[PDB]
Amino acid sequence: NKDKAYWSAIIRTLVAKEMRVEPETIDPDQKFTSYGLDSIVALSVSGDLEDLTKLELEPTLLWDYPTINALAEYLVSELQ
Template structure:
């Protein structure tokens, strides 16, 4: 069951991440498979750091710069973000 977390769902976060990653990699969002490691698409450290900054800006979360390596697929990253958003909401934060 997908529980909305601060207005976000697994589907909305998957779409958001695929769009961001596609932008960095100059691909179409539909080309980003949620189960393929981002490194296989050629995501480098500069793009990973930019992604980290975008997550922090758009979701008001503090992320480690290694997030793209710690959670190497869109699906893994979405799972982590849902947990972080749930924790943030539980602590009275959220967007």
């Protein structure tokens, strides 16, 4: 069941917890930086995703794939 929607829900949860807001308030297609996400948060989120996926994931992936859904798409690709 680990499709794009699965990873999108996980990433949204991680981002919302770091930003201290409810996940429903975050648009998964909006650029991370347009709602204030910074480098400390990018490191937190990518590191947590490493813990969950066993992948090596640089914090700059949140620049390269700059929305929740874009990052989810990347994870699916890496794990397929």
